Design a binder for this molecule. Structure first.
Ligand SMILES: Nc1ncnc2c1ncn2[C@@H]1O[C@H](COP(=O)(O)OP(=O)(O)OP(=O)(O)O)[C@@H](O)[C@H]1O
Ligand SMILES: [Ca+2]
Lengths: 123, 362
């Protein structure tokens, strides 16, 4: 299911972050990477370059403490879709606010920050 | 822009609605009624049972009568949802391991009979997992006639590890009827069975320790509750409150040789790659009407904790809205901006026929 943002996903080594906004996957402005609204859900793709030339992928869907069911449900589904689009090469990780993995937390050089708020539910 | 519909075909209750809504607009009995001596569907058929013979076209989540199923779908579109089906993409749910032939038939009916512009079939348990915000976990889906244990990894169910307990809500309602007799109470007619159902849904609970709970009910009247029948009479329920749902864990109560739901879950987990079992134990999602008993999550936690190594972190997820988890999950999926790609279109159906369902819907 090729979505415009999927066409951009995992092209080069690096980090990509999208926020779930009303049943759609919206990119987060690169200057806001690391600043997570606790009322939202996000999808993070971490592309790492492999010797052979191909890339390694890790898909993390981050769930804010107050995100609505539609947002967390969509983040999970978009994560399955992105993985499928990337030929099933991504390892998927569920990241809950306050309980993120060392790996995920490590993607943010100056440490990630939480901020109250977010976009309204899509229901 | 197009509005998709979502229909979850339960064996006892059908849930229908519009993608984007947080709850189904219509919930009604999956019954088709015909003159005992045209037809009716849902609540009306149930009401007119005095003059109609009722039929349930869905058994254990599997459709057994396609003419009746069509009647139910026709009714759902025109009467319950008040839509013209040829104007809406339709997402339908199916039981895990739905026979290949049935998937094609459901597909054929939607396109040929109802002329849906697009359609999609999703496994019930997978929709529930999605609704819980997870791509990996094991779902324990218990509704009317069966309880399924469905291990899912990274968005996809593991067919080889899917198991089932042929015991669910209707069996527990049946059991309550029976054990209530030993107390003296007699419930045998339909309206009476509805009372027993209400008693099960309002006063039953799963005890954390059954033997200790029975001892408590026997040596005290502390666990007793009073129920008021619609005919003024006030009856008294004792250990039947927990003995009823205890059947899920002890199927022998219903003379079944099968293992309780905690063991079925464990067994399904043990059939999966050892590398992913940790993720299943840590994400046991309960869904379905029969998982609504108070205390069931604590009991599932205790039983699973007892079967798995003490190192294993057991987590039971039992959302308050779990009766509609499957439907909510479908509403979300159908609402995604990427859903328009996933569905089977008329064009595709016309070109490939019913079998296209095996290539477009896992
Ligand atoms: N609070 C409750 N406590 C216990 N059981 C309940 C409660 N609410 C509903 N139920 C039971 O759940 C069952 C119906 O569940 P559900 O709607 O999930 O099934 P279904 O869709 O018709 O079945 P299936 O998924 O097997 O096809 C009935 O036996 C009903 O009595
Ligand atoms: Ca939000």
């Amino acid at each position: 299911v090729e979505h415009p943002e999927f066409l951009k996903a995992g092209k080069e080594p690096g980090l990509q972050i999208w926020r779930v906004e009303k049943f759609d996957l919206v990119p987060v402005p690169t200057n806001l990477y690391g600043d997570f609204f606790t009322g939202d859900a996000y999808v993070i793709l971490k592309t790492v370059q492999l010797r052979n030339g191909n890339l390694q992928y890790d898909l993390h869907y981050w769930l804010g403490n107050e995100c609505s069911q539609d947002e967390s449900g969509a983040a999970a589904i978009f994560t399955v879709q992105l993985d499928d689009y990337l030929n099933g090469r991504a390892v998927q990780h569920r990241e809950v606010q306050g309980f993120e993995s060392a790996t995920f937390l490590g993607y943010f050089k100056s440490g990630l920050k939480y901020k109250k708020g977010g976009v309204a539910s899509g229901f | 822009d197009v509005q998709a519909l979502v229909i979850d075909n339960g064996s006892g209750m059908c849930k229908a609605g519009f993608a984007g809504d947080d709850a189904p607009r219509a919930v009604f009995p999956s019954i088709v009624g015909r003159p005992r001596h045209d037809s009716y569907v849902g609540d009306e058929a149930q009401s007119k049972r005095g003059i109609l013979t009722l039929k349930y076209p869905i058994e254990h989540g599997i459709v057994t009568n396609w003419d009746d199923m069509e009647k139910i779908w026709h009714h759902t579109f025109y009467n319950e949802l008040r839509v013209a089906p040829e104007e809406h993409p339709v997402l339908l749910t199916e039981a895990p391991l739905n026979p290949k032939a049935n998937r094609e038939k459901m597909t054929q009916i939607m396109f040929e009979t109802f002329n849906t512009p697009a359609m999609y079939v999703a496994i019930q348990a997978v929709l529930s997992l999605y609704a819980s915000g997870r791509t990996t976990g094991i779902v324990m889906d218990s509704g009317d006639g069966v309880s399924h244990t469905v291990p899912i990894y990274e968005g996809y169910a593991l067919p080889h590890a899917i198991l089932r307990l042929d015991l669910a809500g209707r069996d527990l309602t049946d059991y309550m009827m029976k054990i209530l007799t030993e107390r003296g109470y007699s419930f045998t007619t339909t309206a009476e069975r509805e009372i027993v159902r209400d008693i099960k849904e309002k006063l039953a609970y799963v005890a954390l320790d059954f033997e200790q709970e029975m001892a408590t009910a026997a040596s005290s009247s502390a666990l007793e509750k009073s129920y008021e029948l619609p005919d003024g009479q006030v009856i008294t329920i004792g250990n039947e409150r927990f003995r009823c749902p205890e059947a899920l864990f002890q199927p022998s109560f219903l003379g079944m040789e099968s293992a309780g739901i905690h063991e079925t879950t464990y067994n399904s987990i043990m059939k999966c790659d050892v590398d992913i079992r940790k993720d299943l134990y840590g994400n046991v999602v309960l869904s379905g009407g029969t998982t609504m008993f108070p205390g069931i999550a604590d009991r599932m936690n205790k039983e699973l904790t007892a079967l798995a190594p003490s190192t294993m972190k057991i987590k039971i997820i039992a959302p308050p809205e779990r009766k509609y988890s499957v439907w909510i999950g479908g509403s979300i999926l159908a609402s995604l901006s990427t859903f328009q790609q996933m569905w089977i279109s008329k064009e595709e159906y016309d070109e490939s026929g019913p079998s296209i369902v095996h290539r477009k819907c896992f």
